[PDB]
């Protein structure tokens, strides 16, 4: 009952402007199907579509519980719904995957690398997945990657899809108040409406009043993701939760979303992938032939202009304007990372998390031993010119020893840390009476020895 009393929704009560089609209004619905305020004159009413979705067909039977929320709501009210009503802990990582709304197909082992590589990173960090909701394009690759692993939904995979309410097929079938509404994995090819992804877990249906049109979720998702980043993480050392942005393909619009993330306080690192095409491939080709970031010569500039006007089929002035936004992204070339095939996107996502953390390197090392990932440490935490505090490497070595991390001990031996200077009587004693690690039979033997001693 708290869902209906706290969150709102809006319905299309307009003057029905015809524009193109006589049946299609400004909101695109049928003329007799009715029942922002500019040209739509919408009214505010309490929500009538919340509860749980039972997915019939489409593989495994899975429940993805949902709520229809007005697009102008404050994200503070929504975060209380995740934490209290939906019993979700605060994530240790937020990732937000964007891309093209059009369906596409990539390389088959690019689909394998994206398959295992994402869902391993979500498992090791306990992360939240933020997609576009509907089962088109990049999100169709997301749910297919969830078909690869599935399994531990109890380990908080949490693929929350944020989609507009207007384009999800069978809207009247999904009307209920805390009631299990059965939903089909049938998607009609004749209908322009597209269905939700079948293997999600939570849904933020954002109604702006209109139907069949996008843009009802972009402003809500950006304000929500900022709102999570202001929440202090459970380590409570002075940092919020990390946020990274995963980019595959995309159109000319997603380039502006990159500049929105980069020109932001705090800055959000992005990661791109190669081989999908379109906006991801032009951002990749910008990165390798870049020199000093925005310092791009004329011949490579014209090669970028002709590839924009060919792949995105734009004009000369539209390609030049997209090149301006690409140069504005180029200024912050350090924040972006590029994944190239030929190894997974685990290392790319976690490297971008390291770059966007901007914390102390002993804290990065402690996060690395928590992650059990050695290669991330050897390629990022031992950076060229990394400041090392006096004794912090010794504490990291001690934690690696008591945590049973043999490869990390190999790393700290490889990068300094004299074994003679490390040892102290109290150090060996405090690593002799540690409880973290495997099962210890030393207690019983030391009890028997102290008993037989006297």
């Amino acid at each position: 009952s708290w869902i209906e009393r706290a969150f709102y929704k809006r319905e299309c009560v307009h003057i029905i402007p015809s524009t193109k089609d006589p049946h299609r209004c400004c909101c695109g619905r049928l003329i007799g199907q009715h029942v922002w305020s500019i040209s739509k004159h919408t009214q505010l009413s309490p929500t009538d579509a919340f509860g749980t979705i039972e997915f019939q067909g489409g593989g495994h039977s899975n429940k993805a519980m949902y709520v229809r929320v007005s697009f102008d709501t404050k994200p503070d009210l929504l975060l209380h719904l995740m934490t209290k009503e939906w019993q979700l802990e605060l994530p240790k990582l937020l990732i937000s995957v964007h891309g093209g709304l059009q369906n596409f197909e990539l390389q088959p082992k690019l689909k394998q690398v994206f398959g295992k590589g994402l869902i391993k990173a979500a498992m090791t960090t306990g992360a939240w997945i933020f997609t576009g909701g509907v089962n088109t394009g990049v999100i169709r690759h997301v749910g297919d990657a969830l078909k690869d692993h599935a399994s531990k939904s109890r380990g908080k995979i949490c693929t929350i899809g944020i989609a507009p309410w207007g384009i999800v097929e069978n809207q009247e079938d999904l009307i209920g108040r805390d009631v299990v509404r059965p939903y089909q994995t049938m998607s009609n090819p004749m209908s322009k409406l597209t269905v939700l992804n079948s293997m999600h877990s939570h849904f933020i249906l954002a109604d702006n009043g209109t139907t069949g049109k996008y843009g009802a979720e972009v402003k809500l998702r950006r304000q929500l993701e900022k709102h999570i980043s202001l929440q202090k993480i459970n380590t409570r050392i002075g940092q919020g939760v990390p946020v990274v942005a995963l980019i595959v393909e995309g159109g000319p619009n997603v380039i502006s979303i990159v500049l929105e993330y980069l020109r932001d306080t705090p800055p959000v690192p992005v990661v791109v992938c190669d081989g999908s095409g379109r906006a991801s491939d032009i951002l990749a080709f910008g990165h390798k032939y870049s020199e000093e970031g925005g310092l791009i010569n004329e011949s490579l500039r014209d090669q970028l202009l002709v590839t924009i006007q060919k792949t995105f089929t734009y004009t000369r002035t539209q390609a030049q304007h997209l090149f301006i936004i690409l140069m504005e992204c180029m200024k912050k070339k350090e924040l972006i990372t590029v994944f190239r095939m030929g190894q997974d996107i685990d290392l790319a996502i976690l490297t971008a998390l390291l770059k966007g953390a901007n914390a102390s390197a002993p804290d990065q090392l402690s996060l690395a031993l928590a992650w059990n990932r050695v290669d991330i440490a050897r390629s990022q935490i031992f950076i060229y010119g990394q400041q090392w505090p006096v004794g912090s490497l010794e504490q990291a070595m001690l934690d690696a020893l008591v945590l049973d991390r043999v490869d990390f001990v190999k790393l700290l031996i490889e990068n300094g840390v004299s074994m003679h200077r490390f040892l102290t009587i109290s150090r060996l004693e405090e690593l002799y009476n540690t409880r973290h690690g495997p099962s210890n039979t030393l207690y019983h033997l030391v009890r028997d020895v102290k008993k037989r001693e006297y």
Partner: peptide, 30 residues
């Protein structure tokens, strides 16, 4: 190695098809 060989031969044969299209378009114009 035959897993990456098969993937790259799928890409190389597609690129050879694009090579055939480009060569036919070049030969048509001259």
């Amino acid at each position: 190695r035959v897993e990456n060989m098969s993937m790259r031969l799928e890409e190389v044969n597609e690129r050879e098809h694009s090579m055939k299209a480009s060569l036919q378009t070049v030969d048509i114009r001259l």
